[PDB]
Amino acid sequence: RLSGYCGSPWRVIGYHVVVWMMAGIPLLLFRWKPLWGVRLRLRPCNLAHAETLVIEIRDKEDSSWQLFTVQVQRVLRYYLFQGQRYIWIETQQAFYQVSLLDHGRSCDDVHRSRHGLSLQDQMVRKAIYGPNVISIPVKSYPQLLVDEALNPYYGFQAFSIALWLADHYYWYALCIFLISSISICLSLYKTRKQSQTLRDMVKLSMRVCVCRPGGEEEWVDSSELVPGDCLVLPQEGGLMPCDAALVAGECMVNESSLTGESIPVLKTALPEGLGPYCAETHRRHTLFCGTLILQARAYVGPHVLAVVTRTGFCTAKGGLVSSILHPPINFKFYKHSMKFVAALSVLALLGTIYSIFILYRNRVPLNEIVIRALDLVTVVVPPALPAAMTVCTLYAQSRLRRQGIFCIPLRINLGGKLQLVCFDKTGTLTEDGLDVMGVVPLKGQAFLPLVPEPRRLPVGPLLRALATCHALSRLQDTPVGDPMDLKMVESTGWVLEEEPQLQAMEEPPVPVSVLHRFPFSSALQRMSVVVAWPGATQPEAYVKGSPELVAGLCNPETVPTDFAQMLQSYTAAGYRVVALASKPLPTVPSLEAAQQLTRDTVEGDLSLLGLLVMRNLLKPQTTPVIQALRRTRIRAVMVTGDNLQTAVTVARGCGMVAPQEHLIIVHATHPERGQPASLEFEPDPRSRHLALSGPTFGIIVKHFPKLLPKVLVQGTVFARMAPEQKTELVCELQKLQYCVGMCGDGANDCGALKAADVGISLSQAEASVVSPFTSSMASIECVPMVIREGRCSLDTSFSVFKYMALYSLTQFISVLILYTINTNLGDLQFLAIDLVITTTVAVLMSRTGPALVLGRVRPPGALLSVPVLSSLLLQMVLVTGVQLGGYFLTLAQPWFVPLNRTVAAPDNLPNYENTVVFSLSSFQYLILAAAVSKGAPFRRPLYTNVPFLVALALLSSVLVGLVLVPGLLQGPLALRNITDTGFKLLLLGLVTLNFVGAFMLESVLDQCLPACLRRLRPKRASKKRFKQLERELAEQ
Ligand SMILES: Nc1ncnc2c1ncn2[C@@H]1O[C@H](COP(=O)(O)OP(=O)(O)OP(=O)(O)O)[C@@H](O)[C@H]1O
Ligand SMILES: [Mg+2]
């Protein structure tokens, strides 16, 4: 983020204190456009060298913040923003972030020496970088509650409680207070739980060994570590206190908590004096914070030495934690409710205008008129609204946890509107285990193949190349490492034995030892090893890489002419194949290369030896999930780095690419490299599917920008994709306004997961920080679960909107109808209606889960859609008609009359007006809940969640019992009894008529009649995504 800054000290003690002693009212006003509010009161102008209050000025940012400056100990002026420290430097006369001496301005020589820091005073290093800990703040209950109890909604609720108390409506005020307290408790619990769960991810404290200049040693706590300090890895122990660079020795770590992959990763000592150092160059020579150490070996001497380079939030996990906690925006925002709220507000305004008009006709005193008029606007805003909403997210998260998906959440609703998904091939769409079908000897005989053979008999460079070209290690009493290396070593039958210090057991010629090793990285598809055995003239070198890459990394004469056909035959069958190569590596070059640690020299003029053939089968759950996802018109795309033929075969097996397919290849020598197209198996078939290679996608995006947009739309199989290209592909797809989610397993695609709208990890076992979503089950069947849960949550939220609006308007209309005559509902009646009937039903409404199968129809877009408003208005017409009919029916019977213009106060409540209206409205409050809560395409039937049905039945039974002329609970509580037996036959008949009419109307509106009418004359809507979608019609 880019932004300038400015600051100045406080205004000198004087008029400002006294003026904003009174000017505290505009606090709510300044919540919008806060820059002027801080310019007043606090901020004068000052030079940019003695600032205390520090504020930002935009360069690309749109928000605003103010910061506090602190000095310690040169007084070291500094300030912290978003967890990043900034320190004033005299030479530059500007604030500088704490990254000096890092990011390529220090070389491997000074870094290499950099020993023991110094027996210096603690001020210089500790103060600048601070304590080494990722401090997630904690707050006390009084400190926490003030952050949400000051919202304008709760201020208005307090105003209402004050208003009702002045009117002697004691009971209703208590109900409002209880509901507000419940809402506050729910929000506080949510915030506390989220903060606590995030805090657990941060590691705990411990103490390590740290050396000092000379020969001294120390046993200090981890909190005292600072950059430049050298520490010794303890007893091959556990977690890494902080990021550090390995200067001496070799070890391996488990980076599942940071990269999401549980496969052990080898690390090697940092080369000396090569050049400037950086995280990218340090990837295979550094240890990241929060990563376990499995085994460490002392190359030479009694210690394995690492040098700390980053501490606190600056560490690798610190940035991920900051990005987890601080956020920026989904860009699928929901700012569409303002106009619906305005539409509701205009009705409220006209209703209160009518109330104040008619209320004057009753000659009510000049003071009682205004309070009773204000009561209308007071009741329009529905209490418990925040409570019904904070609980929906809790329900969704709890249900997701129950199924083994651990979401970090605002993306629950986002995941329900996915339209394109990316998948990896190995591990994700297929089995992790690998079966070896043998090797193809190529070490002679006119370069001709010797036919595959699953053997271990012959002795030669190929056998020991297989036996030693790996990075296996012994943990406890079993080997651990890459499954592919384990399977290869199993085929040979050689056993890993417990300068080189690693050797193979089986000794047909003689036992073999490994002098040097180069670990793998996803950027380059190869690994190297230096091997020596007794009696050898000089050590040899063996490498293992992708067949295509190594085929071009060896002597051109050695590789056979028909290598392409040989590689295509096995790959086209669905096998996963590799290649092996070896180098004579003469004596002096062999000795110097290992000493100098230069990798380029070893991976030079090699000689191809053979190919390993592996069998990798699809997971049984892969095909049904893909078929179900694709049936609902959701695009599925394969992003893989494997060979293109194998990826195409797997995609065909998975069910993808049913119709014709085509290939685009890099075969062109012209400087622009015009890309030809070939039919996998002439006109331009618009039903074609496109498959691209890594370099092909890398050059097309560069040289043919305008051909790219209609290639991504049709691309299905991406092969030989580099780890950085996956993120590029994900970002490019989003430029088409796509909503892309990705499911990845390996560590190479960690960056792609972050870029995607929703990222799901399959092999991970906890709610880590790498991806927003983590799946404990190693299968792709979780994506449909996420999609269905998201759409169900969205539908539940819309239903909550509708029910809350209906209840608010119903209460408003009932109160106004009472106002038309001369009477008001009793305070106890309001307490009942609000606290019990509305709240218990609203809170329990969101319990029902998602449907068992996905549907073609997508969830609703916005509230302003004609069907929602039309249904609301029709339901209100029905409700008001029912209420007015019930009211008018009473006049037929001999019923006396209320003492209008005699008392005209809420003390004559024992009358026939409030009784019937209350009885009819109480039933409607429950009837409306069922009508709108009903669901099918996205939610399970209403009778699925037992508690909601039980509560509805209990409330309906209680109300019906009340109606059926009891001698109790109906007289003392401001209700009037009637001897005529019109309850069962007529009043309940009208209630049932309302019930059936509302449900029939809701069914009619649910059916496609309202939507089909809107289809005329055109169909296009105002949503901008349709503008990009229509381009597919022109592109196909
Ligand atoms: N020992 C090895 N270490 C690393 N990569 C290897 C090794 N042997 C072969 N490879 C090659 O790595 C190439 C691609 O690297 P990458 O890590 O992207 O493969 P991958 O992880 O199998 O891809 P995917 O995740 O799609 O399966 C593959 O062609 C594979 O043959
Ligand atoms: Mg994988």
Author numbering: 36 to 108, 161 to 414, 416 to 496, 498 to 587, 609 to 791, 815 to 1169
What text does the study give?
ATP13A2, which is mutated in juvenile-onset Parkinson’s disease and autosomal recessive spastic paraplegia 78, is a transporter with a critical role in balancing the polyamine concentration between the lysosome and the cytosol. The overall structure of hATP13A2 has a canonical P-type ATPase architecture, with the cytosolic A domain linking to TM1 and TM2 domains, and the N and P domains sitting on the TM4 and TM5. The P-type ATPases transport substrates by coupling ATP hydrolysis with protein phosphorylation states and adopting a series of intermediate states, consisting of E1, E1-ATP, E1P-ADP, E1P, E2P, E2-Pi, and E2, in a process known as the Post-Albers reaction. Here, we report seven cryo-EM structures of hATP13A2 in six intermediate states, importantly including the putative E2 and E1-like states, thereby providing a nearly complete atomic-level conformational cycle spanning the Post-Albers reaction process.
In the map obtained after incubation with AMP-PCP (an ATP analog), a blob of density was clearly visualized near the KGSPE motif in the N-domain, suggesting the conformation of hATP13A2 was successfully trapped in the E1-ATP state. The ATP analog tethers together the N, P, and A domains of hATP13A2 in the E1-ATP state. During the transition from the E1-like to E1-ATP state, the A domain, P-domain, and N-domain of hATP13A2 are tightly tethered together by ATP to form a catalytic center for ATP hydrolysis and aspartic acid phosphorylation. Distinct from the E2P map, the E1-ATP map has no corresponding SPM density near Site1. The further structural comparison suggests that Site1 in the E1-ATP state is covered by three hydrophobic residues—W251, Y256, and F963—which may sterically hinder the binding of polyamine substrates. The first conformational change within the TM regions involves Site1, which is closed in the E1-ATP state, open in the E2P state, and closed in the putative E2 state, indicating a gate function of the entrance site during substrate recruitment. Adjustment of the inward-opening cavity was induced by the separation of TM2 and TM4b, which formed angles of ~30° and 37° in the E1-ATP and E2-Pi states, respectively.
